Amino acid sequence: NSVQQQLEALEKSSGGRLGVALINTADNSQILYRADERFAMCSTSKVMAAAAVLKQSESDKHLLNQRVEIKKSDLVNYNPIAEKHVNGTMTLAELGAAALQYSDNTAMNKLIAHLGGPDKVTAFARSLGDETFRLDRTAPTLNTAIPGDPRDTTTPLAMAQTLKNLTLGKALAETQRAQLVTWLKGNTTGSASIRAGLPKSWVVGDKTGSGDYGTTNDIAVIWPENHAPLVLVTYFTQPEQKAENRNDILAAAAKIVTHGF
Numbered sequence: 001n002s003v004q005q006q007l008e009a010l011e012k013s014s015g016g017r018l019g020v021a022l023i024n025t026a027d028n029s030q031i032l033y034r035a036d037e038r039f040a041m042c043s044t045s046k047v048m049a050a051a052a053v054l055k056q057s058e059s060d061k062h063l064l065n066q067r068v069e070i071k072k073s074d075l076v077n078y079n080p081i082a083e084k085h086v087n088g089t090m091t092l093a094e095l096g097a098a099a100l101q102y103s104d105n106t107a108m109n110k111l112i113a114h115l116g117g118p119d120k121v122t123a124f125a126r127s128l129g130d131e132t133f134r135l136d137r138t139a140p141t142l143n144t145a146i147p148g149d150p151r152d153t154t155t156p157l158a159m160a161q162t163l164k165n166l167t168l169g170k171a172l173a174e175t176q177r178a179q180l181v182t183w184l185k186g187n188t189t190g191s192a193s194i195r196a197g198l199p200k201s202w203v204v205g206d207k208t209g210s211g212d213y214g215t216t217n218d219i220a221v222i223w224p225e226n227h228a229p230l231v232l233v234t235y236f237t238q239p240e241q242k243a244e245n246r247n248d249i250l251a252a253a254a255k256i257v258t259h260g261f
């Protein structure tokens with residue numbers, strides 16, 4: 001069957017709401033599925049906050065090396081990296097790395113506090129042409145992912161275009177661009193999501209995100225071995241609050257749309 005029908009069948013059987021947006025930079029073609037609908041980003045929004053910090057460094061060559069104090073009071077629900085540097089310091093380059101690679105929520109909160117609140121992260125998204133992205137809360141409350149709640153949401157299509165600009169396009173300067181890709185490529189939390197649906201040979205840099213309502217997300221940039229890069233967004237959410245997180249569904253969705261590449 002077609003790509004569309006397989007996703008509908010996957011959604012109908014999963015008992016949830018599935019969002020997909022793939023961009024083939026080869027011909028700028030698109031595979032869409034509920035790509036104009038709002039989903040809760042969860043911890044995928046961390047790519048924006050880090051990118052916002054990277055953009056500042058284009059005008060300040062001493063910003064990323066700037067230390068940041070990590071108090072015991074700054075710790076929240078999940079932070080495997082920041083818990084090690086209590087009563088110590090971590091540079092923004094380390095905060096940025098931890099936020100994306102290990103999904104450290106404290107590091108994420110340090111980047112926002114530095115920028116000047118979630119509104120500053122949103123204003124940064126606007127400068128890139130993204131009229132859809134919005135960030136209203138810090139971590140971990142930004143992962144509530146309540147149905148119908150517009151806070152901390154964006155559409156699959158908007159993020160794919162922005163993520164494409166950030167890693168392959170004109171959003172950042174080259175040095176800053178290569179740094180973001182380096183971080184995404186070194187992600188340790190997405191082995192079971194989109195990567196599990198692709199050939200193991202393909203190079204992949206992604207950012208996952210999990211929250212309540214079985215909300216399970218993954219945004220990724222893909223480099224084929226003999227083709228132009230791909231940009232894939234896979235959002236998924238369920239109607240009941242304490243649903244299980246389904247990364248296997250994101251793995252299935254990636255294999256369905258990437259079928260042929």
Ligand SMILES: *C(=O)[C@@H](NC(=O)/C(=N\OC(C)(C)C(=O)O)c1csc(N)n1)[C@H](C)NS(=O)(=O)O
Binds near residue numbers: 140209
């Ligand atoms: C971002 O999405 C962030 N998610 C969370 O911290 C929450 N849960 O994650 C854990 C690992 C605890 C889980 O078992 O689901 C969460 C649920 S509700 C809420 N208000 N926060 C994590 C850290 N990032 S991710 O990309 O690794 O999933």
